[PDB]
Amino acid sequence: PEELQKREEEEFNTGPLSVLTQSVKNNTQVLINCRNNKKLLGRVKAFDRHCNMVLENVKEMWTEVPSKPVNKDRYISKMFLRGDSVIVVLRNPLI
Amino acid sequence: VKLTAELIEQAAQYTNAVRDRELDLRGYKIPVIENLGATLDQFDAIDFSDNEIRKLDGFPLLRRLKTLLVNNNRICRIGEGLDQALPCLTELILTNNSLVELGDLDPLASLKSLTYLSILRNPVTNKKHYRLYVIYKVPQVRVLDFQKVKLKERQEAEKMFK
Amino acid sequence: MKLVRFLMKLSHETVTIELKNGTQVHGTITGVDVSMNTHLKAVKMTLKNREPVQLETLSIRGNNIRYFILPDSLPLDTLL
Amino acid sequence: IRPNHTIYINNMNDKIKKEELKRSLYALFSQFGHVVDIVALKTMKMRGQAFVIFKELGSSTNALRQLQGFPFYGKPMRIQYAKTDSDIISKM
Amino acid sequence: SIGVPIKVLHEAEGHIVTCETNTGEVYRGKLIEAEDNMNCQMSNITVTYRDGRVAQLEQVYIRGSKIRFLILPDMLKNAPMLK
Amino acid sequence: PLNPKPFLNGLTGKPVMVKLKWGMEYKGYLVSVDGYMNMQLANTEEYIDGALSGHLGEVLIRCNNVLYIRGV
Amino acid sequence: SSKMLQHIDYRMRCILQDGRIFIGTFKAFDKHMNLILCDCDEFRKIKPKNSKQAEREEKRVLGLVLLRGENLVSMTVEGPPP
Amino acid sequence: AHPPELKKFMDKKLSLKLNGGRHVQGILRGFDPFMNLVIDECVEMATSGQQNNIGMVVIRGNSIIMLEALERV
Amino acid sequence: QKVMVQPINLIFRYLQNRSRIQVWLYEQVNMRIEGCIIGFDEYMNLVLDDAEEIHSKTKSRKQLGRIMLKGDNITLLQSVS
RNA sequence: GGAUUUUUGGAGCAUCGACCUGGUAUUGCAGUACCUCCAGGAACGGUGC
């Protein structure tokens, strides 16, 4: 109800996902690591309690060995990522 | 009555006694085998008992097929493009045919994965040195007319027609 | 709010669901449930280092899907 | 003896594998009729014996009249009628 | 409630079934008692250990977390629950 | 006795090192720890195989990703 | 909805998590992504491990198979109900 | 949340096989609803011929895949 | 008619006795964390003091200290002392 | 619908199945992991490390 929604808003604003609340406040890009060693950097439009994220204008980079591996990357306009494959989410990336 | 996709779609496809998917098509009297590509490679054995097929040809590319049953027919000639259509063929049942010359089994050696063969009740087996010519033509066949190949038979096949 | 309600309100959209074991199925998603079960029609599936096959219908589970890719002509404000 | 749908075959070679013998029994009985089931047991009580269940008794009668004393795997096999009915024949 | 494959697995008790483990081991035996969480208790089981070495074990119990598949015998194909 | 939830609540601000199941580690000041074992740290350094690799700053690790969390 | 019940009792092929594919008549299903495949056949691809060797797929028929949802990845229709 | 039917394996010497190729043997002293077992006189067998005694071990349900009873049960 | 020994009671007895126990890792038979178990939780998460992770391959034990092992990675906890 | 059994992630060696040669006893009625044993060659293949 309303009290459960207020508790969920308090847990999203003051809990571990508050950095994710930084993704929807100032529209800052976050970097999420996947299970297949593919780091996706992008803004997060929608989130949930199960860490399911909706990314807009994201860039997914990974290492693929053909020797030395190359940094093959791709750019997706809109994407959705489940919380089961999310390993580490960084709020402020380096570059 | 010609064979089409309606006769193959209305046929009974089930599990055979050899734990493989087989479709029964007995009692059809099809003069030519065509339009057999509607199975979408979901069968391993195709039965063609009681048919009036004069030539075993016109088979589509099927990789899941592993057994061919052409028993009780009137096949006088054999096709040449059978190895390119069934690469995983292992069993061939050509019993009760109209093969008279030994040259009809020359495309039958084109199948490299063939191990089982049945040429019983045929006029080609009545001639002399038929099993030796069948062993010298296709050495990959291990069972010919419900009988295993022999080392002395292989030596007699390699010695003859030199 | 949960993200399953935003994914359940999607019909006749050409999406691309990338699975966990190197599989990616691109097709028109026709049905979505609360358990993230994606039922699509006329899809193309490409496995890990394999040829992309084409299937008339597919039903991927929720736990086997790793990521999703939506088209650019899809607003996220009305779906949330 | 009463004609039945299940036909038994004994006096065969038991040195071959069970799958190859089942494939040979399926290939040899495909000309007489539709083979519904092939019971191939290789235990000590029924070694070298097999059974083929047919849909009609006419195909079993033709297989008994045609393959009377047929050479299979270098041995003269004996094809006869079963003393008891089959399971799928009694269930259907 | 109870699922229809769960009811088919519960109705398959007393016959020779074959469970498959997560490590590739296939154990075939007579299912004595089953549970709703795919817990398979089988007697006269034949373990394979993903190498073909089938050893005869007695009173084996495989949990539902590692149970990948459960090959049921063909006698339960005419069950009214599957229709 | 020492339950893990007051141990995680009392470790806020202290520099802890969370080692994941893939061999990597993240050393930083713990900021947020809820009941679902979700960790959120600030000024975190990511290290691989006992050697420091980078500095990620604010980081958030889930429950099924961090293998252990020790004090430093 | 009832999208999973529309493809019931048809010749469907479900892809496993280990890479195998089980093709059979999925007659019964549940909420835990379980499947009851009558006359099922499992096909698993084998690695060539050479330069000139091809990739083969070993197929074995098991009959009625009860597949849990923890191993099933995706299911596709292959053939109509006979 | 139903407990497993581990009443026949109670106070009996069995052998369980954990994940990753691990295997142990001992007497089951209890049962849990989360498939967690307690093994007394636990002897863990590695890939070598030697076996390590543990005394009292507690195995979780997420790692236990199979357990064969070495007794009549 | 028989009594069953619960694993939670054994974990509470090991925490009260302050005995050094070693817990293995899920799908990893090389690394094992050995330490004094201070307490447990409902989700099988343990808190250890002066714990060290020892590898079976390299035969080296690196100290970690007061660690918090989750329940999803715990496989078997054996009492070493 | 997020806490261990299903759905918000543990990510050169051993064994088995075959292929080819000789001696050997069982001729027997049943719904199946696999069924007699010995000796010789192999330049067949899958799985785990």
UniProtKB/Swiss-Prot annotation, chain A:
Protein role: Plays a role in pre-mRNA splicing as a core component of the spliceosomal U1, U2, U4 and U5 small nuclear ribonucleoproteins (snRNPs), the building blocks of the spliceosome. Component of both the pre-catalytic spliceosome B complex and activated spliceosome C complexes. As a component of the minor spliceosome, involved in the splicing of U12-type introns in pre-mRNAs.
Family membership noted in the UniProt record: Belongs to the snRNP core protein family.
Compartment(s) where it occurs, according to its Swiss-Prot or TrEMBL record: Cytoplasm, Cytosol; Nucleus
Protein origin, superkingdom: Eukaryota
Name this protein carries in UniProt: Small nuclear ribonucleoprotein Sm D2
Tagged with keyword Cell cycle: no
Pfam family, one: LSM
GO cellular component: catalytic step 2 spliceosome; cytosol; extracellular exosome; methylosome; nucleoplasm; nucleus; pICln-Sm protein complex; precatalytic spliceosome
Subunit note: Core component of the spliceosomal U1, U2, U4 and U5 small nuclear ribonucleoproteins (snRNPs), the building blocks of the spliceosome. Most spliceosomal snRNPs contain a common set of Sm proteins, SNRPB, SNRPD1, SNRPD2, SNRPD3, SNRPE, SNRPF and SNRPG that assemble in a heptameric protein ring on the Sm site of the small nuclear RNA to form the core snRNP. Component of the U1 snRNP. The U1 snRNP is composed of the U1 snRNA and the 7 core Sm proteins SNRPB, SNRPD1, SNRPD2, SNRPD3, SNRPE, SNRPF and SNRPG, and at least three U1 snRNP-specific proteins SNRNP70/U1-70K, SNRPA/U1-A and SNRPC/U1-C.
Region described as Disordered: 1-19
Residues covered by the Sm domain: 17-95
Positions with biased composition (Basic and acidic residues): 1-9
Swiss-Prot record, chain F:
GO-annotated biological processes: 7-methylguanosine cap hypermethylation; mRNA splicing, via spliceosome; RNA splicing; spliceosomal snRNP assembly; U2-type prespliceosome assembly
MF-aspect GO terms: RNA binding
Keywords in alphabetical order: Acetylation, Cytoplasm, mRNA processing, mRNA splicing, Nucleus, Ribonucleoprotein, RNA-binding, Spliceosome
Primary location: cytoplasm
Any one annotated GO CC term: U2-type catalytic step 2 spliceosome
Sm domain segment(s): 3-72
The organism's place on the tree of life at top rank: Eukaryota
Compartmental location: Cytoplasm, Cytosol; Nucleus
Annotated function: Plays a role in pre-mRNA splicing as a core component of the spliceosomal U1, U2, U4 and U5 small nuclear ribonucleoproteins (snRNPs), the building blocks of the spliceosome. Component of both the pre-catalytic spliceosome B complex and activated spliceosome C complexes. As a component of the minor spliceosome, involved in the splicing of U12-type introns in pre-mRNAs. As part of the U7 snRNP it is involved in histone 3'-end processing.
Family: Belongs to the snRNP Sm proteins family. SmF/LSm6 subfamily.
Name assigned to this protein: Small nuclear ribonucleoprotein F
Residue numbers of the full-length protein present here: 4 to 75 of 86
Curated annotation (Swiss-Prot), chain H:
Compartments (UniProt record): Cytoplasm, Cytosol; Nucleus
Primary localization: cytoplasm
Gene3D superfamilies: 2.30.30.100
GO biological process, one term: U2-type prespliceosome assembly
A Gene Ontology molecular function term of the record: RNA binding
Pfam families xrefs: LSM (PF01423)
Keyword Ribonucleoprotein among UniProt keywords: yes
Keyword entries, A-Z: Cytoplasm, mRNA processing, mRNA splicing, Nucleus, Ribonucleoprotein, RNA-binding, Spliceosome
Stored PROSITE patterns: SM
GO cellular component labels: catalytic step 2 spliceosome; cytosol; methylosome; nucleoplasm; nucleus; P granule; precatalytic spliceosome; small nuclear ribonucleoprotein complex
Keyword Ribonucleoprotein: yes
CDD domains reported for this sequence: Sm_G
InterPro entries in the cross-refs: Lsm7/SmG-like, LSM_dom_sf, Sm, Sm_dom_euk/arc, Sm_G
Ranges of residues in domain Sm: 1-73
Domain of life: Eukaryota
Chain's role: Plays a role in pre-mRNA splicing as a core component of the spliceosomal U1, U2, U4 and U5 small nuclear ribonucleoproteins (snRNPs), the building blocks of the spliceosome. Component of both the pre-catalytic spliceosome B complex and activated spliceosome C complexes. As a component of the minor spliceosome, involved in the splicing of U12-type introns in pre-mRNAs. As part of the U7 snRNP it is involved in histone 3'-end processing.
UniProt family annotation: Belongs to the snRNP Sm proteins family.
Protein name: Small nuclear ribonucleoprotein G
Lineage: Eukaryota, Metazoa, Chordata, Craniata, Vertebrata
From Swiss-Prot, chain I:
Keyword Repeat: no
All copies of domain Sm, residue ranges: 8-81
Chief localisation class: cytoplasm
Subcellular compartments: Cytoplasm, Cytosol; Nucleus
GO MF terms held by the record: RNA binding
Keywords annotated in UniProt: Cytoplasm, Disease variant, Hypotrichosis, mRNA processing, mRNA splicing, Nucleus, Ribonucleoprotein, RNA-binding, Spliceosome
GO cellular component: catalytic step 2 spliceosome; cytosol; methylosome; nucleoplasm; nucleus; pICln-Sm protein complex; precatalytic spliceosome; small nuclear ribonucleoprotein complex
Entries under PROSITE patterns matching the protein: SM
A Pfam cross-reference name: LSM
GO BP annotations listed: 7-methylguanosine cap hypermethylation; mRNA splicing, via spliceosome; spliceosomal complex assembly; spliceosomal snRNP assembly; U2-type prespliceosome assembly
Keyword Nucleus: yes
Top-level taxon of origin: Eukaryota
Listed CDD domains: Sm_E
Tissue expression from the record: Widely expressed. In scalp skin, it is present in the hair follicle, the epidermis, and the dermis.
The protein's assembly and partners: Core component of the spliceosomal U1, U2, U4 and U5 small nuclear ribonucleoproteins (snRNPs), the building blocks of the spliceosome. Most spliceosomal snRNPs contain a common set of Sm proteins, SNRPB, SNRPD1, SNRPD2, SNRPD3, SNRPE, SNRPF and SNRPG that assemble in a heptameric protein ring on the Sm site of the small nuclear RNA to form the core snRNP. Component of the U1 snRNP. The U1 snRNP is composed of the U1 snRNA and the 7 core Sm proteins SNRPB, SNRPD1, SNRPD2, SNRPD3, SNRPE, SNRPF and SNRPG, and at least three U1 snRNP-specific proteins SNRNP70/U1-70K, SNRPA/U1-A and SNRPC/U1-C.
Gene symbol of the encoding locus: SNRPE
